[PDB]
C-alpha cells in the first residue's frame, strides 16, 4: 500500500522490500494501535461496509502480519493471524472484500496443516471454504496442497517430493515447508523400505531417500538403526514389545482370564 | 459461526491483548462455547495468574463452559473465585444454574461439619465464599 | 383456566405447523415471527420440562429454507443471518437441561450438527455428542437415525470405518417406516454403502436392488463397480461422470478418500500365492496406475498389510505367502466374543418384554 502516515502502510511497503524481522518488531505496536479501533474483531452489525477504516483495511493489515510470521519461520502465530483473518473473507459466504493473496495463504494453511500429520483438520479446511466444487479446483494454488495429500496417501511419494522440487511455490513461501515434508516422507519411504528388502544396494538407498551424497546416507541408516554390510543394507523389520497401551494386552496376565470375566457375564445371563 | 478471532488472542501476550478479546468472549460464552471449550486450558492459564489480575473475569468465562461439559464442583469454584462478576439476583440460565449448585455443594459439607463441630459457619474451616 | 391456557399453546403449534409445507405464505419470511414466538413469551411460560409442548418442525423447517438457497438465496450476504440462527439454536442447547428436556435436547444436536456437516469443522462434533450422553426414555425412533447418521459421517471423515460401521447399519433399523423410508432413508443408504467400500467392499448389490429408489441404485452401482474390479482409468471416468450425485449427498471428499483403496483392490484380486511371483507381471500392471511409483506402490502395500513379502531388486523378485487358506487360530476368538456379546444383548432385549 503506498505509504500516507500509518503504521499500516510502513510493515506493508517494509514487507515488500524485505525486512521481516523488522516487521515483527512492529506487529505488536500495531497490534496496540488497532485495538484502540473497535473494527480488529468482524462484526455483524454490517450492512455491507467494506470501505478502508472498516473491513477492508483490517484485512490487508492481516495479511501482512500471516506473511512476516511466515517469513520469521513462526507458524503458529501465522495461524494466529489466519484465525482473525478467516471471517472477513467469507464464513459461508460475503464477496464484496475478495483477494488473489487470499489463494496463497489457504494453500499455505492446508499444507502447514499437512506437515503436522493431521488428515482430520485437512478436510475440515476444504468444507469450510465457500463451496466444495469451486474453490477446489478453480484454484492454481489450492491444487497444490489437495494433490500432495492424494499422493501422500496413495504412495506415490516420488510424484509429490518432485511437484515441491519443481514448483513456482517453491520459491515464494512453500519453501518453508519443503524441509519439514522432505523429513516427512524419507521417514515414511525408510519403513515401506525396511519391510519390503531383506536386502538393498547402498546405492539404491541414498537415491529412494533423495540424497546423491553418500556420507548422508551412512549418518541415516545408522539413525535408523540398520546394520549395513559392505555395499548393503541389511533391514531388520525391529519390533519391540509394547507402543502405549489398553489391555485385552496384558497389564497382569490372562486373555484366559478376560474369557473368565466375559464368562461371568454371560453365565449370570442363564441361571434366574 | 466462530470464536476463533476472540480465541486466537489469548494465545498472544500482553494484557491489554488478553483484555480486548475477554469481553467479547463473555457476552456470548453460552453461544458460542462448541469452539471455546477446545481452548479451555490457555482460559485456565489467565486464571492461575495473579500479576494478571483480570483472572477472576478469565474464570467467570470458564465456569460456563464447565457446566455445560458438566463438571458442575469444578465450575462451582471458579464461579466464587470471579467474585464480583458472580451476582445471583441477575437470575439467568447461567446464574440459576450454578446458585442451585452451590447450595447443594454447602449442604453436603454441612452434613459431615456438624457431626464434627457446633460454630464451623462462623469458622473458615469452610470456604468464607461460600458461606457469603 | 389451565384448560384455556394449554389449549392456546397447542392451537399455536398446530397453526405454525400447518403454515409450512402445503400452507405457507414463503417459508423465508415467516422465519421472523417464528424466531419471535419462541424467545419471548413461549421458553418463558415453560418451566422445564416441555418435550412434545416443543416440537422439532419449527427449528427443522426454518432451518431447512435457510440451506436451500433458491427460494431464498440470502437476504444478507454478509451472513448474519444464518450465522444468527445458528447462535440462538447452541444457546437453547444450554436452555434444555442435562435432567430434563430430553427429547428436545436431542432435536438441537440433530439440527447444529448438520450445519457443520456441511460447511464447518466436523470435532466442534465432538462436545456435542458428550452432552448428549445422559438418561433418556424420551428421543423418538426418527431423531435416533438422525442422531446415528451425523456420527457416522463425521466418524467417516476422521478416518474411523468401524464405528461409522456399527452406528450406519444401526440406523436403517427402528426408524424406517414409510415417512422415514422415504428422502431420509436414501442419504442413510449412499453413506451406509460407501462406508462398507472403504474399510473393506461392500456386500453384494442384489439386496440393495428392491430397498431403495432405483434412481439413485444405477449411480451407486456404478461407483462400486470401479472400486471393486480396482481399474483406476474406470474409477476417475465414472466420478466425472456422476460428479452431480456426489454433490447434492455432501460427499465430494469421497474422491480424495476411494483413490487410495481403488490401486490397492486392483493388487489384491491378483493372487500372489506362489513361492516366488515375478516382478515383471506386477511392475506391466502398475505402469497404467502410476508413472514413477512402481516399486514404491509394491512396498507400500507390503508395509500395509495387503501382502506379505519379500522383494530383492538385485535379483528382481517378488517372494510371497498363501493368499488363501488364511484365517487361522484366534479369528475364531475375536468372533467367539464378539458373537456372544451380540447373543446377551438379544437375551437382555427379551428379558425386558
Same mark, same amino acid.
Given at each position: 500500500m503506498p505509504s500516507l502516515a500509518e503504521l499500516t502502510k510502513s510493515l506493508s511497503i517494509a514487507f515488500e522490500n524485505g525486512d521481516y524481522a523488522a516487521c515483527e518488531k512492529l506487529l505488536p505496536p500495531i497490534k496496540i494501535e488497532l485495538i484502540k479501533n473497535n473494527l480488529l474483531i468482524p462484526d455483524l452489525s454490517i450492512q455491507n461496509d467494506i470501505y478502508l477504516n472498516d473491513l477492508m483495511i483490517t484485512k490487508r493489515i492481516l495479511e501482512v502480519g500471516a506473511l512476516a510470521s511466515i517469513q520469521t519461520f513462526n507458524f503458529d502465530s501465522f495461524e494466529n493471524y489466519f484465525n482473525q483473518l478467516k471471517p472477513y473473507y467469507f464464513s459461508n459466504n460475503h464477496k464484496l472484500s475478495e483477494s488473489d493473496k487470499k489463494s496463497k495463504l489457504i494453500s499455505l494453511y492446508l499444507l502447514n496443516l499437512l506437515s503436522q500429520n493431521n488428515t482430520t483438520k485437512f478436510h475440515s479446511e476444504?468444507?469450510?471454504?465457500?463451496?466444495?466444487?469451486?474453490?477446489?479446483?478453480?484454484?492454481?494454488?489450492?491444487?497444490?496442497?489437495?494433490?500432495?495429500?492424494?499422493?501422500?496417501?496413495?504412495?506415490?511419494?516420488? *510424484?509429490?517430493?518432485?511437484?515441491?522440487?519443481?514448483?513456482?511455490?517453491?520459491?515464494?513461501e512453500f519453501d518453508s515447508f519443503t524441509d519439514i515434508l522432505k523429513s516427512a516422507i524419507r521417514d515414511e519411504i525408510a519403513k515401506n523400505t525396511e519391510l519390503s528388502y531383506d536386502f538393498l544396494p547402498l546405492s539404491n538407498i541414498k537415491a529412494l531417500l533423495f540424497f546423491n551424497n553418500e556420507k548422508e546416507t551412512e549418518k541415516f541408516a545408522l539413525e535408523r538403526n540398520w546394520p549395513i554390510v559392505n555395499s548393503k543394507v541389511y533391514?531388520?523389520?525391529?519390533?519391540?514389545?509394547?507402543?502405549?497401551?489398553?489391555?485385552?494386552?496384558?497389564?497382569?496376565?490372562?486373555?484366559?482370564?478376560?474369557?473368565?470375566?466375559?464368562?461371568?457375564d454371560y453365565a449370570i445371563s442363564i441361571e434366574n | 459461526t466462530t470464536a476463533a478471532p476472540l480465541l486466537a488472542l489469548l494465545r498472544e501476550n500482553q494484557d491489554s491483548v488478553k483484555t480486548y478479546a475477554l469481553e467479547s468472549i463473555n457476552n456470548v460464552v453460552d453461544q458460542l462455547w462448541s469452539e471455546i471449550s477446545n481452548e479451555l486450558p490457555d482460559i485456565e492459564a489467565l486464571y492461575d495468574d495473579d500479576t494478571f489480575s483480570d483472572r477472576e473475569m478469565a474464570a467467570l468465562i470458564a465456569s460456563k463452559v464447565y457446566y455445560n461439559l458438566g463438571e458442575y464442583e469444578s465450575a462451582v469454584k471458579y464461579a466464587l473465585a470471579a467474585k464480583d462478576r458472580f451476582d445471583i439476583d441477575e437470575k439467568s440460565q447461567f446464574v440459576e444454574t450454578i446458585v442451585s449448585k452451590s447450595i447443594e455443594m454447602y449442604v453436603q459439607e454441612a452434613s459431615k461439619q456438624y457431626t464434627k463441630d457446633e460454630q464451623f459457619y462462623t469458622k473458615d474451616i469452610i470456604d468464607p465464599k461460600l458461606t457469603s | 383456566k389451565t384448560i384455556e391456557v394449554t389449549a392456546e399453546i397447542n392451537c399455536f403449534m398446530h397453526l405454525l405447523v400447518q403454515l409450512f409445507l402445503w400452507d405457507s405464505k414463503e417459508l423465508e419470511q415467516l422465519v421472523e415471527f417464528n424466531r419471535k414466538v419462541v424467545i419471548p413469551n413461549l421458553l418463558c411460560y415453560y418451566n422445564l420440562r416441555s418435550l412434545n409442548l416443543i416440537n422439532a418442525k419449527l427449528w427443522f423447517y426454518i432451518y431447512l429454507s435457510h440451506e436451500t438457497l433458491a427460494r431464498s438465496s440470502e437476504e444478507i450476504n454478509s451472513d448474519n443471518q444464518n450465522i444468527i440462527l445458528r447462535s440462538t439454536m447452541m444457546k437453547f442447547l444450554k436452555i434444555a437441561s442435562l435432567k430434563h428436556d430430553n427429547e428436545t435436547k436431542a432435536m438441537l444436536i440433530n439440527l447444529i450438527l448438520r450445519d457443520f456437516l456441511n460447511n464447518g469443522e466436523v470435532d466442534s462434533a465432538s462436545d456435542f455428542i458428550s452432552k448428549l450422553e445422559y438418561p433418556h426414555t424420551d428421543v423418538s425412533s426418527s431423531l435416533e437415525a438422525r442422531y446415528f447418521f451425523y456420527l457416522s459421517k463425521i466418524n467417516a471423515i476422521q478416518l474411523d470405518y468401524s464405528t461409522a460401521n456399527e452406528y450406519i447399519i444401526a440406523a436403517?433399523?427402528?426408524?424406517?417406516?414409510?415417512?422415514?423410508?422415504?428422502?431420509?432413508?436414501?442419504?442413510?443408504? *449412499?453413506?451406509?454403502?460407501?462406508?462398507?467400500?472403504?474399510?473393506?467392499?461392500?456386500?453384494?448389490?442384489?439386496?440393495?436392488?428392491?430397498?431403495?429408489?432405483?434412481?439413485?441404485?444405477?449411480?451407486?452401482?456404478?461407483?462400486? *463397480?470401479?472400486?471393486?474390479?480396482?481399474?483406476?482409468?474406470?474409477?476417475?471416468?465414472?466420478?466425472?461422470?456422476?460428479?452431480?450425485?456426489?454433490?447434492?449427498?455432501?460427499?465430494?471428499?469421497?474422491?480424495?478418500?476411494?483413490?487410495?483403496?481403488?490401486?490397492?483392490?486392483?493388487?489384491?484380486?491378483?493372487?500372489?500365492?506362489?513361492k516366488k511371483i515375478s516382478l515383471r507381471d506386477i511392475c506391466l500392471k502398475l505402469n497404467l496406475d502410476s508413472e514413477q511409483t512402481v516399486e514404491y506402490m509394491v512396498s507400500r502395500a507390503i508395509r500395509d498389510g495387503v501382502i506379505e513379502?519379500?522383494?530383492?531388486?538385485?535379483?528382481?523378485?517378488?517372494?510371497?505367502?498363501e493368499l488363501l487358506n488364511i484365517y487361522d487360530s484366534e479369528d475364531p476368538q475375536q468372533v467367539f466374543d464378539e458373537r456372544i456379546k451380540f447373543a446377551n444383548q438379544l437375551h437382555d432385549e427379551y428379558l425386558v418384554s
Open positions: 476444504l468444507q469450510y471454504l465457500d463451496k466444495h466444487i469451486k474453490n477446489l479446483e478453480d484454484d492454481s494454488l489450492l491444487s497444490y496442497p489437495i494433490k500432495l495429500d492424494r499422493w501422500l496417501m496413495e504412495g506415490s511419494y516420488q *510424484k509429490a517430493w518432485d511437484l515441491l522440487q519443481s514448483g513456482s511455490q517453491n520459491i515464494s533391514f531388520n523389520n525391529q519390533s519391540k514389545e509394547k507402543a502405549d497401551y489398553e489391555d485385552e494386552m496384558m497389564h497382569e496376565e490372562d486373555q484366559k482370564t478376560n474369557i473368565i470375566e466375559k464368562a461371568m | - | 436403517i433399523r427402528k426408524a424406517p417406516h414409510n415417512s422415514k423410508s422415504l428422502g431420509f432413508l436414501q442419504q442413510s443408504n *449412499k453413506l451406509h454403502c460407501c462406508i462398507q467400500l472403504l474399510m473393506g467392499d461392500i456386500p453384494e448389490l442384489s439386496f440393495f436392488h428392491q430397498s431403495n429408489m432405483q434412481k439413485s441404485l444405477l449411480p451407486y452401482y456404478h461407483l462400486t *463397480k470401479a472400486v471393486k474390479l480396482g481399474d483406476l482409468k474406470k474409477f476417475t471416468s465414472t466420478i466425472t461422470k456422476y460428479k452431480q450425485l456426489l454433490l447434492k449427498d455432501d460427499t465430494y471428499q469421497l474422491c480424495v478418500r476411494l483413490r487410495s483403496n481403488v490401486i490397492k483392490t486392483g493388487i489384491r484380486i491378483i493372487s500372489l500365492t506362489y513379502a519379500k522383494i530383492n531388486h538385485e535379483d528382481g523378485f517378488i517372494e510371497t505367502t
